[PDB]
Design a protein around this ligand. Structure first.
Ligand SMILES: CCCCCCCCCCCCCCCCCC(=O)OC[C@H](COP(=O)([O-])OCC[N+](C)(C)C)OC(=O)CCCCCCCCCCCCCCCCC
Ligand SMILES: CCCCCCCCCCCCCCCCCC(=O)OC[C@H](COP(=O)(O)OCCN)OC(=O)CCCCCCCCCCCCCCCCC
Ligand SMILES: CCCCCCCCCCCCCCCCCC(=O)OC[C@H](COP(=O)(O)OCCN)OC(=O)CCCCCCCCCCCCCCCCC
Ligand SMILES: CCCCCCCCCCCCO[C@@H]1O[C@H](CO)[C@@H](O[C@H]2O[C@H](CO)[C@@H](O)[C@H](O)[C@H]2O)[C@H](O)[C@H]1O
Ligand SMILES: CCCCCCCCCCCCO[C@@H]1O[C@H](CO)[C@@H](O[C@H]2O[C@H](CO)[C@@H](O)[C@H](O)[C@H]2O)[C@H](O)[C@H]1O
Ligand SMILES: CCCCCCCCCCCCO[C@@H]1O[C@H](CO)[C@@H](O[C@H]2O[C@H](CO)[C@@H](O)[C@H](O)[C@H]2O)[C@H](O)[C@H]1O
Ligand SMILES: CCCCCCCCCCCCO[C@@H]1O[C@H](CO)[C@@H](O[C@H]2O[C@H](CO)[C@@H](O)[C@H](O)[C@H]2O)[C@H](O)[C@H]1O
Ligand SMILES: CCCCCCCCCCCCO[C@@H]1O[C@H](CO)[C@@H](O[C@H]2O[C@H](CO)[C@@H](O)[C@H](O)[C@H]2O)[C@H](O)[C@H]1O
Ligand SMILES: CCCCCCCCCCCCO[C@@H]1O[C@H](CO)[C@@H](O[C@H]2O[C@H](CO)[C@@H](O)[C@H](O)[C@H]2O)[C@H](O)[C@H]1O
Lengths: 345, 98, 105, 318, 115, 83, 172, 114, 69
């Protein structure tokens, strides 16, 4: 696409969440959700082949249906209270329908089946955008109404998302699905702590973003979609194995990496509220994430899979990637646990 | 007013049922997404008129503005789905299971 | 908001038509402007949790003006009790309720 | 007394519609160096009634492949909307006084495109489907400019009420401050009413008869009555908007007589145009409207937004 | 009420002419009369098959421009505001981006029909 | 400065619709800036009295608020009669 | 005339029931026109005018395009109608039975709260400035040019971006 | 919870100004400049009090002055006034601009006579 | 010749004047010899309703002037 289209489309993608985040009125929050939905569509389907077209279609009908449900909440609330914002007096069922619709937009299970497939049909950089920047708008709405959310709905969604994300990711050889199920599981953690401490949902989002960004950038370095494709990194970009491994352990919540901090503080704050049972199952199923992250580490940095003859040409050539952002996000996403007290508050 | 919102709200539910219960054509599911926009627009219009809130009457227009864009973007996608398989049947959009 | 930019810059992109009692074109009050203006002034500065209990009087009145549940109930009871009397034959409406008043002015 | 007032609207219009078919055939005649009808009655005056009677004794068609519900609905809708476009017209006092009459005319006119679409689709024939998909193309062509042209003219008028155009044009036709929009408005009305050189939905040359190829008898008669009623109305509307007839509150008979003379004259120019030009290609109709009229109409919309502002000539709300 | 009366009267006339057209003529139905028309030969295929739309991009661009009419139609009321500078500036920009959007599509061969 | 005239003459010959469209578009943005009447558009709209002019209680420190409407004080529409 | 609004909302409901059963998009586009028209009449009954005619205008142009797309992309040999299939015909009939039941039931257990059949018409217009002048919905919608100019920026940008969005989506 | 206090039907009795709108509109400009002080106090009462029950005295002085104003025209300028509003009544919007000739005669009666 | 078009053009002319003339007169015949009152805004509708109430015959067009006070 020509530079005018990129400027218009990339500005609109950026504009959406900023409108949702800066808006007092609910209809303007909805408007920002529409900008993101509309402008991402051309980006997703740019390569125009049978798979990205299905991906851009499944995404549209999912996110448009969820939009209509959110709008119904915004309108039933204006009927009940004559105002364009949710109040303590807003009907209970109005809030729950907003929650289910937004979770449908985030990809939280059981409204999750679309996310792994859409992430699979699109290029890596748009998976990065979809799994990161596109989550801030629905989440910023939820953080604005956390005093009102029914915790029983939120915890069932979070428990479901942590389980389904673990089980789903355990069966995947496609990296883009492993990233989608990774996302689903982490959204479970952000959502579980939402009605209690919304600040910890922002900590878990930010740490997830700076872990998920370099991971995509790492796969975008050689355009590697499979476990066998990523297994050739020792013979292609061996300098990358040291930080891919840590980021994967960091995404797994293993100490003493930055990714342990979000799970650990969420568990700590959940049990300040006596949320013992939910917290225990959440931490016990987060163990399953580490297993299929460990399996990836086995295939890439801790063993050498067979390589092919044509990869010798690849070595004669010179790469201009990755950029200075990959190194900055790799270190901060793994070696920042000793700064934990400065991140929570 | 009480009886009207109940009928309008049930109208929105029927279209949400229509959207969530696919048949063959993707175009038919697009028309249900317009049944929902029409129900929401009529509710907002009646709410604003009944309460005499003139400052809220811009809002029903924006719903139509941001509903057309979806209808346009939805129809644009339906062209790409037809250019691939020659129909708009949803059962064809299933490559991504693997 | 989540990024109080409008408040920081001191502008108002959408803050000025949030509720019924907001400014209307040609100074046309909205229905229940009096009640809402009371409720928003009651619950101002004390926070949402205090306001849910300490401005329950203002809110339940605004809620009644807006939705009129009790008003329709009450007028349903008067009309239904009159229906019962008239079937028995113990009440005939006045001339001014049966379409024969001396109109004012 | 209101029912009698419907009679003195729907009957004179229907009689005037029929004779438009006779005037069309004789003006086209003399323009082609012949005489047109002149045997069926004195100078053919009975020819319209013969054609009507013959069409309603002709066997009606129920094709085996046809979708009957829409097949029948479509001609019924066509003639209903043609007659309904008339009830708001102020001449100089309208039968039904609407605040947003102009929108009622825009909205009713658009809905009548569905009689072409549904009939063509319901015929389940290839030539009738070609005709329907030209109705879609023709509407996409003229709709955008036609609404904006009205917006430009109504910013000198102050409202969407048709009866307020009488008062706007008390001292001058809107044709003078607005002749560029009248020129573009006039061509739109030829496209709105499927009139040559824009008879693309019918287009006997390319499509045998277009959307109504499978229609015979009385159902086909209703389509024509609708087509010719619209011609009078669109030219009657153009007479009110742009050629404001003389209005004296003491002589309402003057306004009607002057209104009629200009409406007849504009209706003739439709017949004059049909005899003079070849038919557009329906792809070229879109290019005419989107690449010529639309750029000019947007500029005139911006001209007429600013024009009342920098002359302090804002029309009154009432 | 008048506007409801006049339109039922219009509908009843259209209905009444429809009934007379079907029950007055003498009808003789047989299969070869009621087949579809196609210039004297049998159709080679049903008329319900897909019919490619060579102007589809203009069709959906009509929708976007159709809603931009819905934003300009309040102008007759809007020129009654005290904030004339604002009303005018918003109006000029709105029409100008519709024009800028139209120019982009025109130069991208978007108004051209697909061959 | 020399080639433009050649272009403009060229466009004016073969594309007057666009040359007319740009001129009218650009002429509509200049005319409000330079007209000596653009200021009255707001004033006339402000001088049209839809709502009732609710009177104010005369405390006693109102020396420039008329008592009776036919007083020599208050906003006047002479500029509009003689406009 | 006391049942007037109730009937319009009942017709609106069916139009969306027929729409939800999803026959051929030729008929689904017919239900949206009749629901669009019915819904237009509701906004008129409640005192609207500009909002009534606009939603009718906008949905008239949307179904024109949708018709063009149906004949090109969403058409099969034997288009389905509401009577075409016995199972759909069952749920259209049954769907109407349910509303006659839900309205009658819910009217029995509250009598006023939701459906107040006893008092249809009594509660349509609540207040109205009887000596007003400036009250048309057009004046409220026109506030986008002065007071809620932000509404128009996002609306204009939405449409402006959409042209760029669709040209890229449909590009070859 | 409280009992709304309503005035009794004999608290609401006044002498009515039973003239058609054209009659009021024809006399509207002079009446605004003659019954102004009485009129201007009722409106102040109404916006200050926000209650119709609290101004049922100022509002009966509105009817007091409106009737006096018409009695002064029914005793000095009855026929110039009757030609004017009878001509203002004809128009369907009761527009002043169709009666500038009768209007002048009625003005040149109140001015000289009153 | 060409003037043989006139017999039909004249019929069409008479037909197109009956609507305007008949409606104007019918309005006067059903509104006491006055133009049918137009009500664009609520204020004008209020005046008609008040005129209907003070007429004494429940018709808004039966005006009462100074005779009545
Ligand atoms: C105007 C037309 C109305 C009168 C003709 C109605 C035709 C009709 O229904 O005949 C009665 C019907 C017969 O309908 P039909 O099939 O004979 O209608 C044909 C009309 N003619 C005879 C002129 C060709 O009687 C019945 O048997 C059922 C009643
Ligand atoms: C909150 C932000 C969430 C992250 C959203 C991702 C935004 C970046 C979108 C993208 O396309 O990422 C890929 C980007 C392209 O850059 P590159 O890989 O070097 O290739 C082309 C350059 N010639 O490569 C990048 O530079 C990605 C950098 C991501 C920055 C994350 C900051 C936190
Ligand atoms: C197909 C059937 C023909 C369809 C006709 C479609 C065109 C109708 C458009 C809607 C008419 C409209 O716009 O309503 C105007 C009018 C409101 O009046 P208003 O503009 O406010 O001015 C006077 C108020 N004092 O409205 C009114 O006065 C009251 C509402 C009248 C609504 C007319 C409905 C037409 C009849 C449809 C019957 C169903 C067809 C089957
Ligand atoms: C990426 C964000 C940063 C850039 C910010 C946005 C400003 C960009 C300025 C550079 C603009 C260049 O963008 C310019 O776009 C036009 C269309 O508009 C393209 O031009 C295109 O249309 C013209 C129309 O005559 C034809 O030649 C052809 O169809 C095609 O080339 C140019 O090839 C490109 O040079
Ligand atoms: C305030 C405005 C904010 C603007 C925000 C801008 C965010 C930055 C966007 C960066 C986009 C560039 O990122 C994207 O890079 C990838 C490579 O990874 C390119 O993507 C590429 O994928 C593969 C191989 O990589 C190629 O076969 C393909 O043809 C090409 O598209 C895209 O063409 C480019 O768009
Ligand atoms: C209960 C009365 C109240 C109204 C009920 C109707 C509400 C609206 C429902 C709209 C959805 C219809 O739900 C319908 O579900 C059926 C399965 O049953 C699915 O339909 C699918 O299976 C059925 C059954 O063989 C086939 O006839 C159909 O052609 C096929 O598409 C679709 O997903 C949806 O068309
Ligand atoms: C990105 C798209 C941008 C392209 C479109 C740009 C449009 C820009 C239009 C600028 C024109 C504004 O023009 C401006 O009009 C206003 C009011 O109308 C005038 O303002 C004047 O009149 C107003 C009332 O009308 C008075 O209250 C004010 O005190 C006085 O200054 C300005 O003197 C003139 O400069
Ligand atoms: C597309 C299909 C549309 C069909 C929709 C249905 C149309 C019929 C409307 C049914 C709604 C209720 O219709 C009618 O409402 C009135 C008041 O409004 C009810 O109530 C009426 O009778 C009751 C006693 O029973 C009395 O208080 C009084 O006379 C009146 O209120 C009636 O019992 C009911 O017959
Ligand atoms: C980077 C992406 C965003 C860039 C594009 C958007 C730029 C903003 C343009 C929209 C500007 C709206 O500008 C905003 O208008 C509103 C009303 O319209 C004004 O707000 C005003 O509203 C009403 C006016 O009756 C008053 O009651 C209120 O007190 C006053 O604040 C704001 O003071 C002004 O800031």
């Amino acid at each position: 696409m020509n530079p005018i289209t990129l400027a218009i489309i990339y500005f609109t993608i950026f504009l959406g969440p900023v409108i949702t985040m800066s808006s007092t009125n609910l209809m303007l929050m909805w408007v920002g959700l529409e900008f993101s939905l509309l402008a991402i569509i051309p980006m997703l389907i740019n390569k125009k082949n049978p798979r990205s077209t299905e991906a851009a279609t499944k995404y549209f009908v999912t996110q448009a249906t969820a939009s209509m449900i959110i709008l119904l909440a915004i309108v039933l609330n204006y009927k009940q209270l004559g105002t364009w914002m949710f109040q303590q007096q807003t009907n209970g069922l109005i809030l729950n329908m907003t929650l289910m619709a937004l979770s449908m937009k985030l990809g939280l299970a059981p409204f999750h089946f679309w996310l792994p497939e859409v992430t699979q049909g699109i290029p890596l950089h748009m998976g990065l955008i979809l799994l990161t920047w596109q989550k801030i708008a629905p989440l910023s709405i939820l953080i604005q109404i956390y005093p009102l959310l029914n915790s029983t709905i939120i915890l069932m969604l979070a428990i479901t998302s942590i389980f389904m994300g673990a089980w789903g990711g355990l069966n995947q050889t496609q990296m883009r699905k492993i990233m989608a199920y990774s996302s689903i599981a982490h959204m479970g953690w952000m959502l579980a702590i939402l009605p209690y401490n919304p600040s910890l949902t922002l900590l878990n989002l930010m740490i997830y973003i700076i872990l998920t960004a370099p991971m995509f950038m790492a796969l975008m370095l050689n355009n590697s979609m499979t476990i066998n494709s990523i297994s050739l990194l020792w013979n292609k970009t061996p300098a990358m194995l040291t930080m891919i491994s840590l980021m994967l352990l960091s995404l797994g919540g293993l100490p003493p990496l930055t990714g342990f901090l979000p799970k650990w503080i969420i568990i700590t704050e959940l049990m300040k509220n006596n949320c013992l049972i939910m917290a225990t199952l959440m931490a016990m199923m987060a163990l399953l994430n580490l297993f299929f992250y460990t399996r990836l580490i086995y295939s890439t940095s801790l063993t050498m899979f067979p390589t092919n003859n044509n990869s010798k040409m690849m070595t004669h050539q010179t790469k201009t990637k990755p950029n200075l952002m990959f190194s900055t996000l790799a270190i901060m996403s793994t070696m920042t646990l000793p700064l934990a007290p400065q991140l929570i508050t | 007013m009480p009886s009207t919102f109940f009928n309008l709200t049930m109208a929105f539910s029927l279209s949400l049922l229509g959207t969530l219960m696919f048949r063959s054509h993707l175009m038919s599911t697009l028309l249900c997404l317009e049944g929902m926009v029409l129900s929401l627009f009529i509710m907002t219009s009646v709410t604003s008129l009944n309460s005499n809130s003139m400052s809220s009457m811009p809002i029903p227009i924006t719903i139509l503005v941001f509903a057309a864009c979806e209808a346009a973007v939805g129809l644009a996608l339906l062209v790409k789905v037809s250019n691939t398989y020659g129909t708009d049947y949803v059962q064809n959009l299933n490559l991504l299971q693997c | 908001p989540f990024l109080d930019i409008q408040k920081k810059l001191g502008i108002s992109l959408d803050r000025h038509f949030m509720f019924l009692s907001a400014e209307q074109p040609y100074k046309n009050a909205a229905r229940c402007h009096a009640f809402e203006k009371e409720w928003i002034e009651c619950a101002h500065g004390i926070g949402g949790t205090r306001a849910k209990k300490e401005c329950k009087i203002e809110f339940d009145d605004f809620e009644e003006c807006l939705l009129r549940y009790k008003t329709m109930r009450r007028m349903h009871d008067i009309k239904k009790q009159r229906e019962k009397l008239m079937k028995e034959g113990k009440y005939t409406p006045p001339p001014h309720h049966s379409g024969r008043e001396e109109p004012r002015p | 007394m209101f029912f009698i007032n419907i009679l003195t609207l729907l009957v004179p219009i229907l009689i005037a519609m029929a004779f438009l078919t006779l005037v069309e055939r004789k003006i086209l005649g003399y323009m082609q160096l012949r005489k047109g009808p002149n045997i069926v009655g004195p100078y053919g005056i009975l020819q319209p009634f013969a054609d009507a009677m013959k069409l309603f004794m002709k066997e009606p068609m129920r094709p085996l492949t046809t979708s009957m519900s829409l097949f029948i609905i479509a001609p019924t809708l066509s003639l209903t909307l043609a007659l309904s476009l008339w009830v708001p017209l102020p001449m100089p006092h309208p039968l039904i006084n609407l605040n947003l009459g102009i929108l009622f005319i825009l909205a009713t006119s658009s809905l009548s495109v569905y009689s072409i679409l549904w009939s063509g689709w319901a015929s389940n024939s290839k030539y009738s489907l070609f005709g329907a998909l030209r109705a879609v193309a023709q509407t996409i062509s003229y709709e955008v400019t036609m609404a904006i042209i009205l917006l430009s003219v109504l910013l000198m008028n102050g409202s969407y009420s048709l009866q307020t155009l009488i008062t706007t044009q008390e001292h001058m036709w809107l044709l003078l401050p607005a002749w560029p929009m009248a020129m573009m408005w006039f061509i739109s009305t030829l496209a709105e009413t499927n009139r040559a050189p824009f008879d693309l939905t019918e287009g006997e040359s390319e499509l045998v008869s277009g959307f109504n190829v499978e229609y015979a008898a009385g159902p086909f008669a209703l389509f024509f009555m609708a087509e010719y009623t619209n011609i009078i109305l669109m030219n009657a509307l153009t007479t009110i908007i742009f050629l404001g007839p003389l209005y004296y509150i003491n002589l309402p008979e003057l306004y009607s007589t002057n209104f009629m003379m200009e409406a007849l004259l504009l209706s003739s120019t439709f017949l004059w145009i049909r005899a003079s030009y070849p038919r557009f290609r329906y792809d070229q109709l879109m290019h005419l409207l989107w690449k010529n009229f639309l750029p000019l109409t947007l500029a005139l919309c911006m001209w007429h937004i600013s024009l009342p502002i920098f002359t302090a000539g804002v029309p009154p709300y009432m | 009420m008048n506007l409801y009366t006049v339109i039922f009267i219009n509908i009843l006339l259209s209905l009444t002419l429809i009934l007379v057209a079907f029950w007055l003529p003498q009808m003789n139905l047989y299969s070869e009369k009621a087949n579809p028309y196609e210039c004297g030969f049998d159709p080679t295929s049903s008329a319900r098959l897909p019919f490619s739309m060579k102007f589809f991009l203009v069709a959906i661009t009509f929708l976007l421009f159709d809603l931009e009419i819905a934003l300009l139609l309040p102008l007759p009321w809007a020129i009654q505001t005290i904030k004339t500078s604002t009303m005018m500036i918003m109006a000029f920009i709105l029409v100008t981006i519709l024009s800028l959007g139209l120019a982009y599509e025109w130069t991208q061969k978007g108004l051209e029909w697909t061959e | 400065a020399g080639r433009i005239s050649a272009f403009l003459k060229n466009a004016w010959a073969k594309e007057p619709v666009l040359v007319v469209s740009f001129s009218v578009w650009g002429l509509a943005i200049i005319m409000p800036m330079i007209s000596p009447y653009t200021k009255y558009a707001s004033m006339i709209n402000k001088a049209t009295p839809y709502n009732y002019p609710v009177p104010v209680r005369d405390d006693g420190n109102m020396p420039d608020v008329p008592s009776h409407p036919q007083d020599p004080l208050g906003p006047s529409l002479d500029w509009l009669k003689n406009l | 005339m006391n049942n007037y609004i109730f009937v319009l909302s009942s017709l609106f409901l069916v139009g969306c029931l027929g729409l939800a059963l999803k026959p051929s998009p030729i008929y689904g586009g017919l239900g949206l026109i009749v629901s669009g028209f019915v819904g237009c009449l509701m906004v008129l009954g409640f005192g609207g005018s500009f909002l009534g005619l606009m939603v009718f205008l906008i949905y008239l142009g949307g179904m024109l395009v949708v018709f063009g797309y149906t004949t090109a992309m969403a058409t099969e040999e034997y288009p389905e109608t509401w009577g075409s299939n016995w199972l759909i015909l069952g749920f259209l009939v049954l769907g109407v039975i349910m509303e006659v039941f839900l309205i009658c039931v819910l009217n029995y257990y509250d009598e006023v709260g939701v459906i107040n059949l006893d008092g249809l018409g009594d509660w349509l217009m609540y207040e109205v400035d009887d000596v007003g002048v400036m009250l048309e919905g057009g004046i409220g919608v026109a506030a986008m040019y002065s007071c809620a100019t932000w509404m128009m920026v996002v609306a204009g940008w939405s449409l402006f971006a959409g042209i760029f969005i669709i040209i890229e989506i449909t590009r070859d | 919870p409280g009992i709304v206090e309503l005035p009794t039907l004999e608290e609401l009795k006044v002498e009515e100004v039973k003239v058609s709108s054209a009659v009021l509109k024809a006399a509207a400009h002079h009446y605004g400049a003659q019954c102004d002080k009485t009129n201007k106090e009722f409106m102040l009462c109404r916006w200050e009090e926000k209650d119709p029950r609290r101004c049922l005295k100022e509002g009966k002085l509105v009817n007091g002055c409106a009737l006096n104003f018409f009695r002064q025209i029914k005793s000095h300028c009855a026929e110039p006034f009757t030609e004017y509003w009878t001509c203002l009544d004809y128009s369907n919007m009761q527009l002043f601009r169709h009666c500038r000739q009768q209007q002048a005669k009625f003005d040149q009666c109140v001015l000289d006579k009153l | 010749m060409w003037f043989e078009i006139l017999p039909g053009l004249a019929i069409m002319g008479v037909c197109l004047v009956i609507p305007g003339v008949s409606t104007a007169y019918i309005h006067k015949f059903t509104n006491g010899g006055k133009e049918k009152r137009v009500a664009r805004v609520q204020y004008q509708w209020y005046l008609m309703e008040r005129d209907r109430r003070i007429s004494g015959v429940n018709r808004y067009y039966v005006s009462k002037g100074l005779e009545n006070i």
